[PDB]
Amino acid sequence: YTMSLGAENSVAYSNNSIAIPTNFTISVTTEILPVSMTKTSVDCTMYICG
Amino acid sequence: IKDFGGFNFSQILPDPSKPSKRSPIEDLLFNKVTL
Numbered sequence: 001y002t003m004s005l006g007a008e009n010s011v012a013y014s015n016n017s018i019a020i021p022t023n024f025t026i027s028v029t030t031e032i033l034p035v036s037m038t039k040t041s042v043d044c045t046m047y048i049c050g
Numbered sequence: 051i052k053d054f055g056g057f058n059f060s061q062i063l064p065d066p067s068k069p070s071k072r073s074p075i076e077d078l079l080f081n082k083v084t085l
């Protein structure tokens with residue numbers, strides 16, 4: 001099929017109307033980041049000739 | 051109905067007439083960048 005970009009809505013804009021929240025939620029989100037990789041070493045002479 | 055208190059966003063909002071549906075500024079950018 002053809003990709004769909006998301007749900008479609010239309011906010012009710014007007015020149016003398018406003019929207020204000022009356023409650024709240026508290027959410028916890030996760031983020032993962034790599035900081036290092038393994039320290040390796042190679043001795044060229046033993047690798048090449050041996 | 052586009053009544054934003056005097057501000058006019060026509061050059062940045064999409065153009066219904068054109069088939070590409072791209073704003074007036076975005077069309078000049080696409081024309082201007084040709085191999």
Ligand SMILES: *[C@@H]1O[C@H](CO)[C@@H](O[C@@H]2O[C@H](CO)[C@@H](O[C@@H]3O[C@H](CO)[C@@H](O)[C@H](O)[C@@H]3O)[C@H](O)[C@H]2NC(C)=O)[C@H](O)[C@H]1NC(C)=O
Pocket residue numbers: 022023024
């Ligand atoms: C703002 O939102 C919170 C929820 O995020 C509202 O609190 C929730 O209120 C409902 C109805 O009072 C609670 O449901 C009921 O709980 C009782 C247990 O006491 C249960 O017996 C009922 O069957 C029903 O499930 C709900 O538990 C409660 N949520 C929490 C986390 O406590 C709050 O009322 C909202 N504030 C306003 C001003 O609308």
Ligand SMILES: *[C@@H]1O[C@H](CO)[C@@H](O[C@@H]2O[C@H](CO)[C@@H](O)[C@H](O)[C@H]2NC(C)=O)[C@H](O)[C@H]1NC(C)=O
Pocket residue numbers: 058059060
């Ligand atoms: C927003 O600005 C555009 C650009 O000036 C206006 O478009 C012009 O409109 C007049 C009157 O309809 C035409 O004579 C010009 O040829 C239009 N110019 C272009 C480049 O299309 C547009 O009217 C403005 N928006 C409002 C609500 O006035």
